[PDB]
Design a protein around this ligand. Structure first.
Ligand SMILES: CCCCCCCCCCC[C@H](O)CC(=O)SCCNC(=O)CCNC(=O)[C@H](O)C(C)(C)COP(=O)(O)O
Ligand code: SF4
Ligand code: SF4
Ligand code: SF4
Ligand code: SF4
Ligand code: FES
Ligand SMILES: [K+]
Ligand SMILES: [Zn+2]
Lengths: 129, 48, 119, 699, 209, 96, 115, 60, 87
């Protein structure tokens, strides 16, 4: 594997001091591991297949001159993507960020049938086409 | 413009102002939108 | 050349109504995010920007907005001698852009007339 | 034992017989393009975009309605299928109007995206397009019917999910238009969901009209607090401002629907807000002041007056963290007069047993029961998603409903057993014929609305319904677990409060009038200054000052549900959490932070100093308030029933009349809804008639 | 032509590159993990991180390879991977006018042997990967920040790093100095969520897991 | 038309005017509040409504490529005049 | 799995040795920065700041991490030695223009909605 | 000189409205051109997954 | 006065460690509530919770008591001293 006097470093990996993140933005933040919900406006599920990690929204005030959305939170527009939940939580613990993982919701398999639209005894018989 | 004059329209200006920087006719940026959050405007009756 | 990119300006229809309909293509395509648009249905009913600010100090004068605009509302005017003594004067409002459109309309209409066929 | 093997692009997939081609393709991962197929609505097969090629078959089948058979190989990417998709989309885009820059669906339009992926890049249509006159259906859904692709999805949603059969078609050919023919607003608690259902910009959200673009709004997932169902929602906010509320699929709480009071109520969080603390000046007039002065006043009043003269009436939209913070603060001054606006019978077991105040068999269990008995409730307005679930079970499972309250419009047909309380006792004694049905049903369900408990005889009604449940439980026709008794709450901040230990009522205030009152989001107006003793210090901590803050002396501004990360428990016992989307306006702060800072100022500092600490304290009080999205089933119905059969409270003769019996009462219920303007337009539309919803919807 | 818009496809180059990929795989089975030729005729060799010095040297010195120009050396950060950092070597052979790609992997705290001995052009490149990402290259003549300002705290090109950073600069007259302050933008970067929820390319469809 | 607020500030077409008790007005003293006098809300009003003699009519804004995307308006409701969503021009059937 | 490659040191003691000699270099250096860079802070007022910077990341226990910050501190020393940092770059360590931030919950609640 | 003397007739962009915006004349007249222009100037053309290294003899 | 302000029994539904507590709340609870029909005895249960007993006294004081692997008689005894240890 690696023959260089391969050393046991069992204790968990932590690069909190090797990222440059200031004091404030490393424990008072709370990342959120979640599979994004499908935009109910559309009907495509291609945006609900990758886990995402995001940071809590902070103060967003209005600029006195023109009215922009001024903010002082550097980790506001930064959202990471991950193939699996375990990798995302590994990244969260590696960088020392508090998390709250939400399980991936999956559409329950329905039971569609064209014939039920024109049933004879049941109430699923449609009154229009 | 003497031979081919540009098309005329109502909204076109009639006095070509020069660079208005410096003079008290400057341009000051400002928000062109109204308020978003309103206030409660507490009632006037002492009541209590 | 008639294709010269300069001071941004909002045009309007010959009737008088503004061409802009707040579709936000220009805001969605600006490489520098220099456009801020807020829309609200007007009293008549037409959808027009309640705020259309273009930040000249952040603009890169690419012309992408004037290509993206489906109604030729926002254009890059022929003006380029619009230097200002203070920074804030370069943060353009909707009113300033409309004034530019009303001022350079004679030039901008001719410039588009001599170039729209290439596009 | 029955799975049949079908092929998708060669891959072999086990599919249950009856599975359509579209679901078989979805199993692999391929999502067949579609417009008229919605997994919740019925299958129609008129869009013709799901036309997929089956190997060794010279006919493109409709994957949205074709059941697979053994040995089929669905060639999704075959040239024939691609050409079919291109032709169908050319037909769809032929007469579509060039409204993409003016259409709000732009950027999230199914038609646009499918054209980008499955469709050509030009047009061979060199003729004049059609145009359709717009139709008015109320002040919520703007209709530009020339964009309609006639997928008939709105019609099916109105027929099945909404129940009201007022949407349909007219004419034939290219001129067949989807609408209501005669002028009739599509008025229902679930009406706005058609905006989601429409794949094009034909149906659009009127309050959201021409306000923002889909690609620029930040989506933050949260939990609805208007009703007690706890529907999961997505707040889309841009520039630190709430723009619209969309449903988020949960398949247990709200499927993928939301009510109208949940959708068009974000404007309520823009008017009549409390931003800076108010204190009474020397004329008793409310004036703006710094947080320090108001907190010092409240702290001094709390320090001086102690014992039972200190009280707090928790509101209806409050969170769970603020409730526990206030409970601890008032406990440290030895005040156990924590009351709630809603009244739940505390006689017998009361809040001691969780199942006494929980919809035990969950919302998802409705789709399993065979007989439902609703007592003194109007679930159409009290809990629209619960009524939608009942209707869904009514359609397929042929569940039989029976109402004991006043006759109302519950979309589906029910069997009105009457409207007198005594009928309950009859069903308890077996004298009423329906008792036989109750003993014959294998999965019976009994639901009692929290509105019925609001009456003076709430204890008697609870005892009667518990007698019903025990009578049908002694006969073992009900299966093993199958919790029968259910209490359907209306106020969102009720179950959590009942979990914490708050008194399920307000009678403590009247019995022991306090000299200081902590109105925490209380806007029901149940208790006024007249009931209070004179020179009473009233503290209001909320967001919208409508019925509360005008009465108080310190108007410490709180945070709203869209402006806090807090725990809310629905009527089934599930405890979900809402996340921050916008920060509180002005000088307003989080509710728990306000209470903790007040405790620090007054001296009795609470232990918890962070949100995680408050959640840990919530776990300490109740461990089921942290198991997010987990229904912790309660038990011991026998003990609650035994404790209930001791009071012998007597039913009255007044009929069980729900407070809301028409659409007009559904809209303006809570403070946010009352302060909103779109619900005002809605109550106007429903009250007088159709003439109040005319507008230029041509754009 | 029948394909006036589709880019022409060359298959002879594909065969030659596949043959050389098999050649390199057979030559160094110790480090070559996986070799693949893209549809546009570019060959990529994925090797074990220990094979950085050997494989490159082979590609630089073998008569049949003669890759004597390190065109580019870069890294790609993929947080979802265990060893997120993915170092890429681009080499060009002027004798066989061919370009090759040697790609290795490395986590945050694993060193990589510096290829300065083999390709003396790498000396600056390595520093950049150290400065932008934080991958430490052992046995380097001098590793230092090359692009970031003096006293910078962090690795900008890492995905878990805001594009605006954490600290902005200003001039303070009280101290008469160019001080550094926490970042505070007049207008926050509007994050656009532009991604079609409909699958684009059926070819690159990940199988379900 | 541009009108004057009680403070003295001219209101724009968007109904924007700083409050009297607003410090932001400090920016406008010794300067002017840049406003556009040509109000689009008014300017489109007096444009005559064209008496189109067909059930539907196509509007491109005039000038072909110079105008807006061509859209078709359905002139069937006698109680209202079809208005183009791009330029605001109205149309009406000849008394139906 | 649990055992991985080392950077420079093969145990915590050697990493502490490297930290010790890095502190040696910094402590010896500090007055040279004070004089050469024309700083106005007292010599001790820089030595204690070196001590505080060393004490900041005193909680790390993974050796490879310790070698990593040893290299990073060596680089910062390298910049400080051959006038690669300037007066402003060095002065950034003493956050001067930054207003003091509060630590109690009450002041944070009084000032804004943040954790 | 050679390029000036050998300029061929034809168009200026690939005749594919999914990677090159349609002509402004076509956008204001046809459905597909308008939709493709909207999506290209709001979302852009989705590039197939992959990586490449392309270099040219720049004047440097 | 520590007049036994509130009792909170937090038992797990399924784990055997709370089994005895279940037996108690199955049988020896109705008569307990009959004894003092004012005590807010809370039986808020949760999955994967070590059976515990909280005794909130006056002025906001609590003393958690573990009920792990207790018997029904054991839980009864460990509660009777709590509600009998107050005047
Ligand atoms: C300001 C002007 C000048 C310019 C700027 C001057 C300051 C520049 C500082 C650059 C160096 C960097 O900050 C720190 C580094 O690399 S490593 C710190 C020590 N951290 C560890 O080694 C981890 C474990 N910690 C311990 O083991 C104990 O802390 C100790 C080492 C004391 C042993 O204690 P024991 O023995 O009791
Ligand atoms: S031309 Fe100016 S305003 Fe238009 S997109 Fe480019 S930078 Fe933005
Ligand atoms: S692209 Fe043109 S029409 Fe659309 S918002 Fe910008 S200026 Fe207005
Ligand atoms: S519904 Fe709207 S966005 Fe979609 S194609 Fe039609 S006009 Fe364009
Ligand atoms: S209005 Fe919308 S949902 Fe109804 S048929 Fe037309 S396209 Fe379908
Ligand atoms: S989806 Fe199958 S035809 Fe409409
Ligand atoms: K829609
Ligand atoms: Zn027009």
């Amino acid at each position: 594997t690696q023959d260089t006097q391969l050393i046991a470093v069992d204790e968990k990996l932590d690069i909190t001091t090797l990222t440059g993140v200031p004091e404030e933005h490393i424990k008072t933040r709370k990342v959120r591991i979640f599979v994004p919900a499908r935009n109910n406006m559309q009907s495509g599920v291609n945006n609900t297949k990758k886990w995402k990690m995001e940071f809590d929204t902070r103060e967003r005030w209005e600029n006195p001159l023109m009215g922009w959305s001024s903010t002082a939170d550097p980790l506001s527009n930064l959202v990471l993507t991950f193939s699996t939940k375990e990798d995302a939580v590994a990244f969260a613990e590696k960088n020392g960020w508090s998390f709250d993982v939400e399980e991936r919701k999956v559409p329950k398999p329905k039971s569609k049938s064209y014939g039920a639209n024109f049933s004879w005894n049941k109430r699923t018989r449609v009154s229009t086409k | 413009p003497t031979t081919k004059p540009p098309t005329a329209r109502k909204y076109i200006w009639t006095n070509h102002k020069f660079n208005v920087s410096g003079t008290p006719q400057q341009y000051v940026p400002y928000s062109t939108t109204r308020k978003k959050i309103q206030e409660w405007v507490p009632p006037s009756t002492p009541y209590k | 050349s008639p294709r010269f990119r300069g001071e941004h300006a909002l045009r309007r229809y010959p009737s008088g109504e503004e061409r802009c309909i707040a579709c936000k293509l220009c805001e969605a395509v600006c490489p520098a995010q220099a456009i801020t648009i807020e829309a609200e249905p007007r009293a008549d009913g037409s959808r027009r920007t309640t705020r259309y600010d273009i930040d000249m100090t952040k603009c890169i004068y690419c012309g992408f907005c004037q290509e993206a605009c489906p109604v030729d509302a926002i254009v890059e005017g022929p003006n380029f001698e619009f230097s200002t003594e203070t920074h804030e004067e370069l943060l353009y409002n909707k009113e300033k852009l409309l004034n530019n459109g009303d001022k350079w309309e004679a030039e901008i209409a001719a410039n588009i007339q001599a170039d729209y066929l290439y596009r | 034992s029955n799975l049949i093997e079908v092929f998708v692009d060669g891959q072999s997939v086990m599919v249950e017989p009856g599975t359509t081609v579209l679901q078989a393709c979805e199993k692999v991962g391929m999502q067949i393009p579609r417009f008229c197929y919605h997994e919740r609505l019925s299958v129609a097969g008129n869009c013709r975009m799901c036309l997929v090629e089956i190997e060794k078959a010279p006919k493109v089948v409709a994957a949205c309605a074709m059941p697979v058979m053994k040995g089929w190989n669905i060639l999704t990417n075959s040239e024939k299928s691609k050409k079919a998709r291109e032709g169908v989309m050319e037909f769809l885009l032929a007469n579509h109007p060039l409204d993409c820059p003016i259409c709000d669906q732009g950027g999230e339009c199914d038609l646009q995206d499918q054209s980008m992926m499955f469709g050509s890049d030009r047009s061979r249509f060199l003729e004049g397009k059609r145009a359709v006159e717009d139709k008015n259906i109320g002040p919520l859904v703007k209709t530009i019917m020339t964009r309609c692709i006639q997928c008939t999805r709105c019609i099916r949603f109105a027929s099945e999910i909404a129940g009201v059969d007022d949407l349909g078609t007219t004419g034939r050919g290219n001129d067949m238009q989807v609408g209501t023919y005669i002028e009739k607003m599509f008025m229902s608690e679930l009406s706005g969901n058609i905006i989601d259902i429409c794949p094009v910009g034909a149906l659009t959200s009127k309050p959201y009209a021409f306000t923002a673009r889909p690609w620029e709004t930040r989506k933050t997932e949260s939990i609805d607090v208007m009703d007690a169902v706890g529907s999961n929602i997505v707040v889309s906010t841009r520039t630190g401002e709430v723009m619209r509320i969309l449903p988020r699929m949960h398949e247990d709480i709200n499927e993928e629907w939301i009510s109208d009071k949940t959708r068009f109520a974000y404007d309520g969080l823009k008017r009549q807000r409390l931003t800076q603390p108010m204190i009474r000046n020397e004329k008793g007039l409310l004036t703006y002041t710094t947080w320090e002065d108001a907190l010092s006043r409240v702290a001094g009043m709390l320090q001086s007056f102690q014992g039972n003269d200190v009280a707090a009436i928790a509101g209806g939209l409050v969170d769970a963290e603020a409730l526990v913070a206030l409970k601890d603060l008032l406990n440290r001054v030895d005040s156990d007069s924590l009351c709630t606006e809603e009244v739940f019978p505390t006689a017998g077991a009361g809040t001691d047993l969780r199942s006494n105040y929980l919809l035990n068999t969950t919302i998802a269990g409705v789709e399993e029961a065979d007989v439902i008995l609703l007592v003194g409730t109007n679930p159409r307005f009290e809990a629209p998603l619960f009524n939608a679930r009942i209707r869904k079970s009514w359609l397929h499972n042929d569940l039989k409903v029976a109402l004991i309250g006043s006759p109302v419009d519950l979309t589906y047909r029910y069997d009105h057993l009457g409207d007198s309380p005594k009928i309950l006792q009859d069903i308890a004694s077996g004298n009423h014929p329906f008792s036989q049905i109750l003993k014959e049903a294998k999965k019976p369900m009994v639901v009692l609305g929290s509105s019925a408990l609001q009456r003076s005889d709430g204890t008697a009604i609870l005892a009667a319904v518990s007698n019903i449940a025990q009578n049908i439980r002694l006969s073992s026709g009900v299966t093993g677990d199958w919790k029968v008794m259910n209490i359907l709450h209306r106020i969102a901040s009720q179950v959590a409060a009942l979990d914490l230990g708050y008194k399920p009522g307000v009678e403590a205030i009247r019995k022991n009038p306090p000299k200081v009152l902590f109105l925490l989001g209380a806007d029901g107006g149940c208790i006024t200054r007249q009931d209070l003793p004179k020179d009473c210090f009233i503290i209001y901590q909320g967001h919208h000052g409508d019925v509360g803050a005008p009465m108080a002396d310190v108007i410490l501004p709180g945070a709203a549900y869209t402006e806090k990360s807090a725990t809310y428990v629905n009527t089934e016992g599930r405890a979900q959490q809402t996340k921050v989307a916008v920060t509180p306006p002005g000088l307003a702060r989080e509710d728990w932070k306000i209470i903790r800072a007040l405790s620090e100022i007054a001296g009795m500092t609470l232990p918890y100093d962070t949100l995680d600490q408050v959640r840990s304290r919530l776990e300490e009080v109740s461990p089921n308030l942290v198991r997010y999205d987990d229904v912790e089933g309660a038990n011991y119905f026998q003990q609650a029933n035994e404790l209930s059969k001791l009071v012998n409270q007597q039913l009255l003769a007044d009929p069980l009349v729900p407070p809301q019996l028409t659409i007009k009462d559904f809209y303006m219920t809570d403070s946010i809804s009352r302060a909103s303007q779109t619900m005002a337009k809605c109550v106007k539309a429903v009250t007088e008639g159709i003439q109040a919803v005319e507008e230029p919807s041509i754009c | 032509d029948t394909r006036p818009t589709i880019r022409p496809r060359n298959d002879v180059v594909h065969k030659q590159l596949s043959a050389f990929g098999q050649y390199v795989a057979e030559i160094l089975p110790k480090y070559v993990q996986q070799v693949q030729v893209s549809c546009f005729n570019e060959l990529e060799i994925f090797i074990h991180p220990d094979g950085v010095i050997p494989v490159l040297t082979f590609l630089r010195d073998h008569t049949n390879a003669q890759f004597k120009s390190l065109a580019d050396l870069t890294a790609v950060d993929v947080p979802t991977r265990q060893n997120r950092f993915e170092i890429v070597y681009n080499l060009l052979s002027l004798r066989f006018n061919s370009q090759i790609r040697v790609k290795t992997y490395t986590d945050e705290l694993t060193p990589i042997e510096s290829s300065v001995t083999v390709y003396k052009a790498a000396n600056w490149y390595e520093r950049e990967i150290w400065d932008m990402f934080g991958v430490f290259f052992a046995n380097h003549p001098d590793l230092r920040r090359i692009l970031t300002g003096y006293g910078f705290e962090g690795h900008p090109f890492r995905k878990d790093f805001p594009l605006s950073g954490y600290v902005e600069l200003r001039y303070d007259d009280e101290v008469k100095r160019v001080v550094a302050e926490p970042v505070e933008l007049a207008q926050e970067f509007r994050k656009f969520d532009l991604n079609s929820p409909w699958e684009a390319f059926p070819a690159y469809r990940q199988p379900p897991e | 038309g541009v009108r004057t607020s009680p403070t003295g500030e001219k209101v724009t077409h968007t109904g924007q005017a700083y409050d009297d008790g607003d410090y932001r007005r400090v920016r406008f003293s010794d300067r002017q509040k840049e406003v556009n006098e040509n109000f689009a809300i008014d300017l489109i009003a007096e444009q005559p409504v064209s008496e189109v003699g067909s059930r539907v009519i196509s509007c491109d804004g005039g000038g072909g490529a110079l105008g807006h995307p061509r859209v078709y308006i359905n002139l069937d409701k006698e109680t209202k005049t079809g208005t183009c969503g791009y330029c605001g021009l109205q149309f009406r059937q000849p008394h139906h | 799995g649990t055992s991985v490659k080392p950077i420079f040191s093969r145990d915590m003691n050697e990493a502490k040795r490297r930290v010790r000699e890095l502190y040696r270099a910094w402590y010896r250096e500090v007055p040279n920065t004070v004089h050469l860079f024309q700083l106005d802070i007292s010599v001790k007022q820089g030595r204690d700041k070196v001590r505080e910077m060393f004490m900041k990341n005193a909680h790390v226990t993974d050796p490879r991490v310790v070698d990593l910050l040893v290299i990073k501190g060596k680089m910062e020393l390298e910049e400080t030695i051959n006038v690669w940092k300037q007066r402003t770059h060095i002065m950034r360590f003493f956050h001067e223009t930054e207003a003091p931030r509060p630590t109690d919950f009450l002041s944070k609640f009084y000032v804004g909605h943040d954790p | 000189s050679q390029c000036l003397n050998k300029m061929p007739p034809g168009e200026i962009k690939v005749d594919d409205a999914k990677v090159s915006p349609p002509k402004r004349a076509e956008m204001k007249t046809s459905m597909e051109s308008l939709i493709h222009h909207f999506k290209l100037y709001t979302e852009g053309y989705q590039v197939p997954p992959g990586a490449t290294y392309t270099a040219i003899e720049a004047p440097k | 006065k520590l007049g036994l302000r509130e009792i909170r029994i937090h038992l797990c539904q399924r784990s055997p460690g709370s089994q005895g507590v279940r037996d108690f709340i199955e049988k020896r609870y109705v008569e307990l509530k009959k004894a003092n029909p004012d005590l807010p005895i809370l039986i808020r249960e949760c999955s994967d919770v070590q059976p515990k007993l909280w005794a909130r006294y006056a002025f906001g004081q609590e003393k958690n008591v573990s009920l792990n692997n207790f018997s029904a008689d054991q839980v009864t005894r460990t509660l009777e001293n709590v509600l009998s240890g107050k005047a």
